[PDB]
Each structure stands twice: as structure tokens, then as C-alpha cells.
Amino acid sequence: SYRVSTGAAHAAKGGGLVSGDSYSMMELGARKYAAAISDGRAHFESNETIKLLEKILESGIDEKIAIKTINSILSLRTTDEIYSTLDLSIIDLQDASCKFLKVGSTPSFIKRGDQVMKVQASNLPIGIINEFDVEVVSEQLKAGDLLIMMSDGIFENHDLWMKRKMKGLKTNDPQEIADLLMEEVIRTRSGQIEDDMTVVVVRIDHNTPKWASIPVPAI
Amino acid sequence: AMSYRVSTGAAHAAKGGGLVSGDSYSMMELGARKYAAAISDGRAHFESNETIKLLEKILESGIDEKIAIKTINSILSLRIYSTLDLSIIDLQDASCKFLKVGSTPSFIKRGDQVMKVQASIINEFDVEVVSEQLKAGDLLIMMSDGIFEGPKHVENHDLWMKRKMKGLKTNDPQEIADLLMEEVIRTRSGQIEDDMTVVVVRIDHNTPKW
Amino acid sequence: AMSYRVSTGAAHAAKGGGLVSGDSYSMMELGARKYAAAISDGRAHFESNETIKLLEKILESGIDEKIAIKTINSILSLRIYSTLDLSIIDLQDASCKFLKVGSTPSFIKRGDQVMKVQASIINEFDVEVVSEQLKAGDLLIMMSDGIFEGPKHVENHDLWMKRKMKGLKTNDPQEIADLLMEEVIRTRSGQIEDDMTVVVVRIDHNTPKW
Amino acid sequence: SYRVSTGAAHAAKGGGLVSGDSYSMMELGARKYAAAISDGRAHFESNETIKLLEKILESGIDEKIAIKTINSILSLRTTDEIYSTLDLSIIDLQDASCKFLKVGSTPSFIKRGDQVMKVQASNLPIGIINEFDVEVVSEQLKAGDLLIMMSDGIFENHDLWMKRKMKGLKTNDPQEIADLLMEEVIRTRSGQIEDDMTVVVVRIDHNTPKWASIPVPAI
Ligand SMILES: OC[C@H]1O[C@@H](O)[C@H](O)[C@H](O)[C@H]1O
Ligand SMILES: OC[C@H]1O[C@@H](O)[C@H](O)[C@H](O)[C@H]1O
Ligand SMILES: [Mn+2]
Ligand SMILES: [Mn+2]
Ligand SMILES: [Mn+2]
Ligand SMILES: [Mn+2]
């Protein structure tokens, strides 16, 4: 299975504000990659069901209600497949603010400098029924953040292992960090595994290329 | 001013991998606005939009170029969708399908070579459909009108872009994108008459140590 | 001038019916534009649209009226969707859920009785959520501003509509709709200041000979 | 399971042309009925997959291509369920023109006066692969038409039986015609059946209520 490495550059007419151009990309792990440019809407969007989940996150409804509603939405879906687990991270690229939605633990970690914090909510909702083990979190990322997400297989006290090993990373490169973190989990076995393993890593960085600084004429 | 950026990586191992795995992941990026990443334990998380979906299906038919162009037109004449430059890569065998509506155009750089992406009556919406077999190390470059028709006093834009891509002393997609943007902007003088978008994709062999 | 119309019927028998059947059917009508009917042999054919879907899900939660109103508002304040009068009937037990956004309002006629559909802080979009238990022979009547606020010099519109519905000497939905439209139009003089829409639904016992 | 009987009336401001009001309804057989009014889009729409099929019908692409494309669209769907059969009738309410899309025979019949014609294409496409047995038809209906659609169970030379019995109907009322046609199929058994039976009937009629004729002032 081939990988793709991508990159993009975008500039509005009269260097400022909003553009008639749009570009998008999407990757279905190990299967399909798509990229679109349009010169004048979003070329790609979430699932029927993930669209609904996103709308709840986006709303800013209080957290207990969001959890209740997500549970209900999750509640009525095609029994096959049960759509657990779900680990979903949505980064806003204007302010680098990230909303996390988890359905059936994961967990995910944010490495900042040498500090590796786990992605979890400060206030855990109690005194309710949460049948799908739904968790909703809001962190604020900044340039140089490394968000690592993993499945049950690779993740399996495990926080200490991940925390330590993520400090042990001497590289800032996502495709490298992923492969190494895989390597470390596998040699701990010393061979193949019965369970599926996937890890994705995302690095946040602050777009400041030379052409961005080329000045437009004055009057 | 400029929005934040994202650089991503993923590693995947099937159980005794192996044909299949319950696990799946996906990502999508709405340029400059939104990045999403999803992991699920044993129906993709993200998909094309409604109109791109019908066009995507027609591509995936494999029907004759002549009729697909004709049938996509009829579809588009019942919308405007503006222009569309769509590249779809199969990560299993690196084959690629291109759907162009309203031109573009696009280029592939294979070693020192650079070729335009084109297919070997009335075409109302200027539709093209193309297939290619990519290879590890290929660089696919997509761009809007403002980059490609950007250079100030250039007769043959095709030739200008090839020559510039042939001169890229870099296999890094983000550098290439930024370099091509810069070269166009400087032919004017920080002046940006049209919106400018470039997307660069590199095909890699997935073959880590495990 | 006026569009064509449709009058529909369906009969369904499960195998030794019986809890379940591979067969399903559906219909939908986009008022004055489109009618569709589907039969399938062993995922509904038609569904609410994207925004109605989220609102529909919230209704089907069953969450507290106070918070559902509050949560639907927050949802609507991220769109305008205009107004929405939505009635959803469960054909198994004849229970009914109503979602009103931006008023309406609506009425149910049970025998000689006629009651308005209403639920026993800031409500930005004027949202109501209501549940009722309907019964064989009930007549549910829905209408837009132009019908209900239509009558020329009437102080209490609620009372005008009840009195008129109480006087319906007819259990046929299409007749009721046409009669109510006529009564409003004549209070003006063929003059139609606003758009006028009325929808009438009657609940029947399905109990044919078999 | 309850039934609903419905009706509706609609009039644009200043009796003519296009309205800010819209109304819709939908019924999921034996399960759910919904009705919406909006005072200013369609409240209800087809499936993800039926949307795509509809777009192909709507396009006026030639028939062989439409059949090929529908097959491909049909071709890539969730293996469960195989979504065969499909009998789909779409009436345009402006001109009473009906597009039929069939996936795995049915068939459906249009009764006009005492004439009962079967819904099939005049030119059947040959020299192709049609894996889902896709059929696409275009008839023009008129006031007083009775379109009858049925599943494999009730329909089972059967055309002669349906044709005769549909002539034998002495009623113009859809919910009656359906129940009778069920009755006739069942007594032919004389009890219950192993196979599922459903029939839907649609009568086309030409909207001309009294209020439509009430005149608006002249100058
Ligand atoms: O693989 C690289 C790219 O894949 C794309 O589908 C993702 O959207 C992401 O925006 C990029 O990182
Ligand atoms: O049952 C009656 C009604 O059901 C509705 O869902 C259908 O859309 C049809 O427009 C009506 O006939
Ligand atoms: Mn697992
Ligand atoms: Mn442009
Ligand atoms: Mn109005
Ligand atoms: Mn059957």
C-alpha cells in the first residue's frame, strides 16, 4: 500500500481576506486519497452520522446535553456496524482550537515541548447514563504541538509507557513518529499481533512562508 | 493573517497483516479552514460531497471517455459548480483518476521528466477525464488559474511551469508548493491579481521497519 | 395554473404477519412539485433533510422540554431556516411529536372537540416541542401564517379556526383543506395577501378484511 | 398499525406563480408519517443512493448509459443489504410526467379508463451486461390514471390475472383498490403466505377546487 505526502499553498487575490479558490483533501487509510481544487464549497464532508455529531460539538450546547444527544444519535444507527469505537479530532485552522469527540476510550495525547498531556475532560459527567462511553473535550493547540491518536491495539499502566516513549522521540516528523511508536509497541511483542494497530500523528505549525511576506504596493 | 497548518502521519498494521483489519482511519482537510482525523474499531468517516459523488461514480464506472464527458456535461448542466480539478489516487496500486471540469491544468514530475495531465464534438463545460499509473517518487502538482496563468509576460504557460518544476531541487511537497507560489508572485511584484492555489502530492512506498 | 394532484393507498401483509417482512414501501411528496413511491425487497427510501435530521433526533431523544428548546435554539442560531412546523406520527401506536420553530400554529379535532397544539427564559427562535397521543378518527390540521392570520377583521384567530373546524361536515382530509382555504380567501375577496398553506392529516385504524 | 389519510391546499400570495411557503410529507410504510410546513427547501429527500439514481434519471442521458451508470452506482453499495429489488416511481406534479426506475422486475401497471397497460420500456437494451436487471421507463400520465405497484409476493401468466382483476375493480379509490387487490391475491391462497406482499396505488388527478376560481380584483 502506497502512502502520499502532501502540501499546499494558497493566496487570496489582492493579498488579503477571503478567496474564490478552495482546495480540499481526504484520505481513507490505506485505500484512497483525493485532492480537489475549485475556482469560483467543501469538496469533502463527514458521514451522515458524523455530520450530526459535528453539529452538536459546533453548537456549544452544554457538555452533559451534548453527551446525551450524541448518545441518542449514536443510539439510533445501523446495528451493523455498532460504530464503536470512534476517536475524532477536529482542528480549526484559523485559531488552532481542537474539539475532540470520543466514543469508547482511546486515549489521545498532546506533546507540547517536553510536556506530554493526555486528552481528557477536566470535569467527567457523573449521575447519568452514558451507554456509548461518550467523551467530549476542548483543548487549545499551538504551533509545535504533536497530537497522537491510537487504537486499542497499539495502546495495549499504559499512559506512563506512552508518555515516556513520546518523550523518547527525538524527531518532530509525524510519519516518523508514527512508525517509531509502532516499532516500540511491536518489539514489546517481538513479532505479529492478533489485534489491529493504527496510530495517526498530527503536527500543528504556523504557516509563515517567504511569499507571505512579499509586500503589495502602497498608496 | 495566514491560517495555521498541519503536517500528518499514520502507521497501520493489520492482525498478522494480512488482508483485513477492523481498524480504519481517515483524514480530511478543507484548505485553510478545517482538519479532521478519525480512528474507528471494527463506511468511511469522510466522503465527497453530493455532486462530486455522482461525478466520482461515473469516473469509477470506467465507461468510454467520449460518453463519460458527454454524461458528466449533462449532469453539470443541471446544477454553476464553478471549476473542478479532482485527483483520486488508489493507495493500493497507485493508479490515479483525474476529473477536470473547466480546465486547470496539472502536471506530474517523474525523475527529471515533467508531463501535463491530458487524455491521449461539443464539450459544454470543458470536461476532461484521464487515468494514469503513478509510481513511487512521482510528484503530482495541481493548481488554479491564478498560479498557472499567473506569470506576467509568458506565451507558453505549459513550458514555463515544466521548466520551473524541472528545476525544483526538493522532494518535499510543502516546499514545492511554496516555491511555485513564490516564483509566480515575483513575476508580478507582490501583486496578486487572481486567487492562487497550488496542491502538491508525492507518492511513497509504504515500507517501514516491521 | 394549479399543479396536478395525487391520491394514494397502500396495503401491506407480513409473512404470517407477523412481526417482520423483507418488503418495505415509502412515499414522499414535495408539495406541488414531486411525488415519489418506492417498494423494496429485503434504510428508508426517503428521509428528512440535513438540518431537520438533527432536530428530529433531538425530539426523539425525549430530553426535557426546557433543555431541548434551548438546545434546538443553539442549533438554529448556527444556520436562516425560516419557520418550521413539523409533525411526526408513529404509525404503530399513533403517538405524535411536534416541533414548531417560529410558530404556526396547529389544531386537532377529536369528535366535536378542537384543541390547539401547545406544550402544557429567552426563546430566541420561538421554539416549541410537544407530544400527544392521537386516536383513530383524529384530524390533525397544520397551516402557515397566511391561512391562520388570514381572516380580515378577527381579534381571536384561535377561536375563529376552532369554530370553523368544529363546523366541518366532512371527514375527508382534502375537502377539509380546500374548505378551510376557501373560508379564509372569502373574508378577503379572492385577495391573497400572504402565501397560504394548509395540511390535513386523519388517523385511521388499519383493519381491512384479511 | 394505524394508517393516515392526508390532504393539502396551497396558494401563492397574489394568486399566481411561486410561493415562499413549502409543504412536504413522507411515509415509511407501516412505521412513520411526517408532514412539514415552512414559511420563507425540501423537508424530505431520497436516500444517499436513490439521490444518485434520481440524478441519472433527471439528466436525460441516453438510456443504455443511464443503465450502465445505475448498475455501477448500484454496483458499489453496502453488500448488506444488496438493495434488490427496487421499484421507484417519480411523478412530476407540474406536468404529470412519470419516470420509473426498476431494479429487479416488479412490474407495475397503469390503468387508464378500461385500458390496463403494463409499465415497461418499448426498446429493451440488448448486447450489454445488466447485472441488476435495471429498467428505466418514461410514461406520461393524465388525470384519472391509476398507477399500481406491487412486490414479487402479491404479483405471484400473471399479467393476465392482474390486468383482468384491475379491470374488475369498480372503485376509483386507492386505499380501496389496494386492499381489494390484496384480498384477491390472498383468497387465491385461502389463508396466510410465506412471502411478503405489498401493493401501493396512486391516482393522478387535476386539482381544480372552488377557491382556485375565486377571482382577484382588476385594474
Ligand atoms: O497524507 C497527507 C494528507 O492526507 C490528507 O488526506 C489529509 O487530509 C491531510 O490533510 C494530509 O496530511
Ligand atoms: O398516506 C397519505 C400520504 O402519505 C404521504 O407520506 C405521501 O407522501 C403521500 O403524499 C400521501 O398520500
Ligand atoms: Mn481492537
Ligand atoms: Mn480564478
Ligand atoms: Mn408568510
Ligand atoms: Mn419476496
Numbering used by the authors:
A (entry chain B), D (entry chain B): 590 to 629, 635 to 750, 757 to 819
B (entry chain A), C (entry chain A): 588 to 629, 635 to 671, 676 to 716, 722 to 811
Text lifted from the article:
SpoIIE from B. subtilis is an 827-residue protein thought to consist of three domains. It has 10 putative membrane-spanning segments at its N-terminus and a PP2C-type phosphatase domain at its C-terminus.
The crystals appeared from Tris-buffered sodium citrate solutions at pH 8.5 and belong to the space group P6122 with a = b = 89 Å and c = 319 Å. Native data and selenomethionine (SeMet) derivative data at three wavelengths were obtained from these crystals, and the structure was solved by multiwavelength anomalous dispersion (MAD) phasing techniques. The coordinates were refined against data extending to 2.6 Å spacing. There are two molecules (A and B) of SpoIIE(590–827) in the asymmetric unit of the crystal, giving a solvent content of 63%. There is a pseudo-2-fold axis of symmetry running through the cavity whose sides are formed by the β1 strands on each of the two subunits of the domain-swapped dimer. This cavity contained a strong feature in the electron density maps that could not be accounted for by protein atoms. We observed a single manganese ion at low occupancy in SpoIIE(590–827) even though the crystals were grown in the presence of MnCl2 (up to 50 mM). One explanation for this is that there will be competition for metal chelation between the protein and citrate (a tricarboxylate), which is present in the crystallization solutions at 0.2 M. Another is that SpoIIE(590–827) binds manganese weakly.
